[PDB]
Ligand binder design. Structure first.
Ligand SMILES: CNc1nc2nc3c1[nH]c(=O)n3Cc1cccc(c1)OCCOCCO2
Length: 154
């Protein structure tokens, strides 16, 4: 009982782009760019779409870096998130009614104001590792258990 989602991190050698979500999903946390894959769309197309729609950036190459399955206790649908990274972008990120984009130096990532699972996988992302992960959450703030392993093939 899963539903497909994309998540894109715009990661250049000195810095990463995150957006503060002003409302709705993930509000009040620094998020990457992503959402539900639509009907007739490949996962990679959906990721490019979500980045563009949400960030204002246009991406050339996307690289798949991970898959994370989220379980929220009591919610029937598992969220199957396909995670991608790019360093080849065009444009300037645009602040909108839904999000406030900001660049962070890699040693100043705001983990305290991010989803708590990010402290586990973001360091793999930053070191160019690919991963499979699973996080069981109670509410949005508590990780009950998780697994996370590095893989050769996402
Ligand atoms: C940078 N880390 C995270 N960024 C986001 N959500 C994040 C990030 N880390 C995280 O746990 N989430 C929540 C989450 C949970 C289930 C499905 C999800 C996201 O779909 C991926 C699309 O989410 C876009 C919002 O960005």
């Amino acid at each position: 009982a899963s539903r497909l989602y994309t998540l894109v991190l715009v990661l250049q050698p000195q810095r990463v782009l995150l957006g503060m979500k002003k409302r709705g999903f993930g509000a009040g946390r620094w998020n990457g760019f992503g959402g539900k894959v639509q009907e007739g769309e490949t996962i990679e197309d959906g990721a490019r779409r979500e980045l563009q729609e949400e960030s204002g950036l246009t991406v050339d190459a996307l690289h798949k870096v991970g898959q994370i399955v989220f379980e929220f206790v009591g919610e029937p649908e598992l969220m199957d998130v396909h995670v991608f990274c790019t360093d080849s972008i065009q444009g300037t990120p645009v602040e909108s009614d839904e999000m406030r984009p900001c660049w962070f130096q890699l040693d100043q990532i705001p983990f305290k104001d991010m989803w708590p699972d990010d402290s586990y996988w973001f360091p793999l992302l930053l070191q160019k590792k690919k991963f499979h992960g699973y996080f069981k959450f109670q509410g949005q703030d508590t990780i009950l258990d998780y697994t996370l392993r590095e893989v050769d093939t996402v």
